[PDB]
Amino acid sequence: GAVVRSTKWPNGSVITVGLYGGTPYVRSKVKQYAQEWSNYANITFNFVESGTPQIRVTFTQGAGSYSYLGTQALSIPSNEETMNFGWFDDSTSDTEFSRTVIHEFGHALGMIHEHQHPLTNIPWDKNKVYAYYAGYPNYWSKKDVDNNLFATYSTTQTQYSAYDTQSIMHYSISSALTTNGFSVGNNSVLSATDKQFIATVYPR
Residue list for the binding site for Zn(2+): 103, 107, 113
What do you get for the CA distance between the two ends of the chain, in Å? 18
Residue 111 burial (C-beta neighbours within 10 Å; 0-12, 13-18, 19+): buried
Using CA atoms, how far apart are residues 194 and 197, in angstroms rounded to an integer?
5
Per-residue CA distances from 12 to 43, 155, 199 (Å) = 5, 24, 11
Annotated binding residues, written as ranges, equal 103, 107, 113
